Write a structure and sequence with these properties.
Four copies of one chain form a homotetramer. By secondary structure, chain A is an alpha/beta fold. Chain A contains eight helices and 16 strands. The first copy, chain A, has two domains: 170 residues, Rossmann fold, CATH 3.40.50.720; 165 residues, 2-Layer Sandwich (Dihydrodipicolinate Reductase, domain 2), CATH 3.30.360. In chain A, the strands form two sheets. In chain A, strands 3-4-5-2-1-6-7-8 form an eight-stranded mixed beta sheet, with helices on both faces. In chain A, strands 9, 10, 11, 12, 13, 14, 15 and 16 form an eight-stranded mixed beta sheet that branches. In chain A, helix 1 packs across helix 8 and helix 5 packs across helix 7. The longest helix of chain A is centred in the middle third of the chain and has 17 residues. Chain A is globular, with a radius of gyration of 20 Å. Chains in contact: A-B, A-C, A-D, B-C, B-D, C-D. The complex binds NADPH dihydro-nicotinamide-adenine-dinucleotide phosphate (4 copies). The site of one NADPH dihydro-nicotinamide-adenine-dinucleotide phosphate has 24 residues of chain C, from helix 1. Chains A, B, C, D: Pathway: Carbohydrate biosynthesis; Calvin cycle. Chains A, B, C, D: Keywords: Calvin cycle, Chloroplast, NADP, Oxidoreductase, Plastid, Transit peptide.
């Protein structure tokens, strides 16, 4: 309904397309893809996926500049400079920025220069970019926002249950550590990053790094400003991560009561965003889960009556991509066109 | 002087022998190895190691029942039943119990049935077994102890710096999470295991599992009884782990002061046990670390002035094995003639 | 129909059940499972699988000899000694031997001693045990065989296209190497193993070992007796393997002719057993393929006009289990009764 | 004594420096490194290495544009365009091309435009570029060659023993498959790549791909022109690979005679280049071996008296780098000022 582009057909760009494809009566219309790798590459990697498996749909190249998914043709262009895009010419309403390189206003704005009406960054925005997490603060979105951010995968897993903890128990302060699957931003073998730790062979190490949620939860939950901080430990799994949150709360409590609080929200205001799992599972079991965060109930602990530790699972690729679709639906729903 | 026997030539048993081989003027004499796998196996796996690399020493079989390391002939026996071992006949003073199956008094005691004078379990002891962590409470060891425990790798990493935190700031309570390398106790592919999570493919998942390290810390640091708890996350790396500790302390502080407190101890009472690393390193850098615990200084955080988060690295196989040697050395030094 | 019992509820045992569950109008009725790990374990590991994903069926324990799959109750017993199994009492017609420890006549026979009418070993049989590979020599099966073998996963990948090569070009001699995913028989970390190479950390090494696929091929294709040999290279992937076969043929040929030969069989006598893939795919893309062998057409080479090199993919767990089901179906179809 | 510059401080670039550092009385003087990543990054990654371990040398940054190794300062520049490099200004005699992007004459020639006297590509050269393999055809090198190639890692493993096989038995034709560790050219997670197979998650798949090694082996051993071909299977190991070569020979033989032939050469003309291992080892055991190729003797087979299969290990990073140093040594030894 809404004319959508995908700038950056990588893990999130492709997960997004496949997430979108599975939705019924979607308001979005993905008409174009900017894949610097080309048509053959876009069709191949969309069909065959090391993490999601083979796409259950007819996918093929259509000519020299498009691909088709179950008959639907999707234009495919290739340009590293978004100021060279044909968004205006195509009448593109929303650009899904998934390249990871245009996360500030001047960068994402290049899409507007090219004629796109709006931009949704699949990552934290740098600068003065409205950030939103579905199930946490999306009601604050307004059609005037020309550039928005859907935050990070970790922020999407944390914020939902942090919101519950703060409302029910009141968070004085907390820390978080995410044991995170590796991502394309890491090097296969010891190379070159900025980040000397992400420069190291990712399938061989536990890699401490930069955390991507910590301040950002305060962005979507202002009451938490200056109350949280954390880090990330990248480990040798290709997908699915888990956050370990420890917080001192003002109201004394115990593990079972904390879990109960999560189940209540899970069955109500956070249905489809938060889930609570009582089974002794491991990361692989959470692949392709549509929720943003799944509490591992049996792992919840309370020390000294007010120090609560919570363990939550998240599919950083798929679960996050479903949220990108959700945020895109909101954009469409609140359109002033 | 101390005639030593290694029961269970596995990861720890082999790491132990190589750790011991590297010491100068050792008061220990490893005369025999109980390897149910045989002499060829013992010689081969001691020489070639997927984690430590090839042993820089002349290793070979010596007849049917021995092996030699740089000329030093060692005996090799094979019996799954410790009562039937020739410890008395051989005059064995101390047995390094590294099978992982004789961790209680009745089990480890079988070595005493057999004639050994003392047993040192390379793991937490079950029941009433004296537990010691070098650099924390080893001064409490007495020659009267027939059976002793060197705790777990995680306890050895945690205790040292927990001791420092408690002394300098006073720990009210806290929680810990160890992102741990897999170990032989896990299954390569989904297979039977009493622990339904450890039963799952170890190189494919992030596996949550219980840990006693929290309560064990209280064993060697009584002041901490009932103040800690935690869990473990087994991840797809073959060696080297990291502990994430969050504690509320009584004295307000900040990250750099906390890191300073650790360096002070590291340059003094905990020299050779605790180190503080200021480099942006990853898990493979810490292989073959003779200390028990290395603080990653740049990851230390303090929230709300009294919630301290510390990240510490540890080579669970080698570092721990150097501690086993250390404890053995203490046994030999306190032996009563 | 045909009261089937699964002995050994491991990778194959569970893949088998799931493969069977997916069949329509199956002549087989799986009524019992001997799982030494217990009911809870059986239900859990059948539901959650690190390789196949979460089973899309209602699986739960059935109060505690039993489990239920979509309402179908399956009895669960636990005994490491087959002679003590209630096969006779239950009227069990065919036992799927998937423990990997009862592969000879005396061992597998234990199931007959226990009352089972027939045994199907999910592996090469030791000694005089009729071996069959569907699509190659299954027409030779007779109800008189009390104990049969479905060969190995590599033999099931190799035989089908070797049969084609021998008929179409005539194999003078050849060699084979299978770059095989690791299996439960390997060790997670360096540990005891009769085979000093499989004793080594499986996810950290390229491990050369044995196979019997070569001589086993001769079993189902007599014309090939003494004409082939080979080895295996176990690598760090959890599932899916690939065979590299090099043979000198009597009739000069070229790569595309060879590929054509495979497509002819694939569309005819070997439909559902052999496939030919023209896509530039990788191992993960072949997960859950029902065929026994998939030729990677673009990799086919011919040197000196008569030295043919063929690369074929196979899902060693799933593809092989579909063959077990197939052979079981034949057993049922030829039952006297 | 030869002024050497390293272009592209990656896996090979760094392995090269470390190999060079370990040589005694080297005729090479590495005075500069072109690392687009910067000084801090060059120092760090040279010191800490996921595959080689921590560099046993004092490594630090020296100012804003150099690094020091045990006191020796090495200049560090940063430019992606070789024409702009200060080779002429610095008087650079030989440039080690390890970027992987300047492999043809026009590309590597950019270094000559920049003032360098000679270029050594650490990879197969494209077009008319003299290719050499130490121990095979290096005696053919002449100072007139402004741009030379040290071939590929697999070519360096294969050529040496292929040379023996051809001389001793006469190779009519053959095929080869290399089960190769992943390299930086692959993607960590499904991502864009001209090669649709190399685009797939490298630590999750058996990856089928190129090797010009077969035709390259022809380049250094003319007698083998048009007689060999092959492919590569990239697998989930970070370093160390193995080649499987099958060849029909004109002189009937047997496995032990073939192994003998390799030991003869290994103790004589190919000492330091080829080795023969009789131990049942796995890939990890061959890390950091200086030789180019190590035959795994117990794996050698001969079918039909003339079809020879040989398995050889090689450390693709380190062993190859040792050859780069050897070839650089030749350049210095044959310099004509
Ligand atoms: N790895 C192995 O086993 C072997 C590999 N190959 C060897 O040599 C290769 C190099 O691969 P390897 O050492 O593995 O890999 P790497 O990616 O780690 O090596 C060198 C690399 O050069 C880069 N570089 C790229 N473009 C430029 C440029 N324009 N100017 C300056 N520096 C540049 C790097 O930059 P950036 O940081 O942007 O990537 C990086 O450190 C060839 O491509 C070839 O195959 C051959 C033999 C053995
Ligand atoms: N991966 C996850 O779990 C999640 C990641 N983040 C993701 O959104 C990101 C994208 O990461 P992800 O999808 O993982 O990764 P990828 O590398 O796989 O995703 C997108 C990529 O964009 C590239 N690209 C780069 N520059 C341009 C350009 N100038 N014009 C057009 N296309 C371009 C690609 O090109 P090239 O081929 O040259 O690399 C590639 O397919 C942000 O960087 C962020 O973190 C957020 C949430 C979840
Ligand atoms: N791995 C680490 O990082 C550390 C582990 N723990 C280590 O100590 C353990 C040993 O683990 P680890 O060395 O890793 O493991 P491994 O399995 O490699 O070590 C010892 C093992 O003893 C076996 N063994 C078992 N039962 C007997 C028996 N009845 N008689 C004789 N030998 C026997 C072996 O036999 P079999 O061949 O049949 O398996 C094998 O070599 C405890 O169980 C504990 O946790 C503690 C600290 C550090
Ligand atoms: N995996 C593959 O790709 C294929 C494997 N093979 C296999 O069939 C095999 C089975 O291996 P796989 O399914 O991989 O592996 P697993 O280890 O997972 O399968 C079966 C296993 O049986 C065990 N078991 C062992 N001894 C007994 C006993 N005495 N009584 C009852 N149950 C027992 C188990 O017990 P415990 O819990 O103590 O280990 C476990 O679930 C053969 O050994 C063979 O190779 C053949 C074709 C394909």
């Amino acid at each position: 309904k809404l004319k959508v582009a995908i700038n950056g057909f990588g893990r999130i760009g492709r997960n997004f397309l496949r997430c979108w494809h599975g939705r019924k009566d979607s308001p979005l219309d993905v008409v174009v893809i900017n894949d610097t790798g080309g048509v053959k590459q876009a069709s191949h990697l969309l069909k065959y996926d090391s993490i999601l498996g083979t796409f259950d749909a007819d996918v093929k190249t259509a000519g020299d500049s498009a691909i088709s998914v179950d008959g639907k043709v999707i234009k495919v262009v290739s340009d590293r400079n978004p100021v060279n895009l044909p968004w205006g010419d195509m009448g593109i309403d929303l650009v899904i920025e998934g390249t990871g390189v245009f996360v500030d206003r001047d960068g994402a704005g290049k899409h507007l220069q090219a004629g796109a009406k709006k931009v949704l960054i699949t990552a934290p925005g740098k600068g003065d970019i409205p950030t939103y997490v579905v199930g946490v603060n999306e009601e604050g979105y307004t059609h005037a926002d020309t550039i928005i951010s859907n935050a990070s995968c970790t922020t999407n897993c944390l914020a939902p249950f942090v919101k519950v903890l703060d409302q029910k128990f009141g968070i004085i302060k907390g820390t978080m550590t995410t044991t995170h699957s590796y991502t394309g931003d890491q090097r296969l073998l010891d190379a070159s990053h900025r980040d000397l730790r992400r420069a190291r062979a990712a399938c061989l190490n536990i890699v401490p790094t930069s955390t991507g949620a910590a301040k950002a939860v305060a962005l979507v939950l202002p009451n938490l400003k200056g109350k949280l901080n954390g880090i990330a430990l990248r480990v040798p799994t290709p997908n699915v991560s888990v956050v370990d949150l420890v917080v001192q709360v003002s109201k004394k409590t115990f593990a079972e009561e904390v879990n109960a609080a999560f189940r209540e929200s899970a069955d109500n205001e956070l249905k489809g965003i938060l889930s609570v799992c009582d089974e002794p599972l491991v990361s692989i079991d959470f692949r392709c889960t549509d929720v943003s965060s799944t509490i591992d109930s049996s792992l919840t602990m309370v020390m000294g009556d007010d120090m609560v530790k919570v363990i939550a699972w998240y599919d950083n690729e798929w679960g996050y991509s479903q949220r990108v679709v959700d945020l895109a639906d909101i954009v469409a729903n609140k359109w002033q066109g």
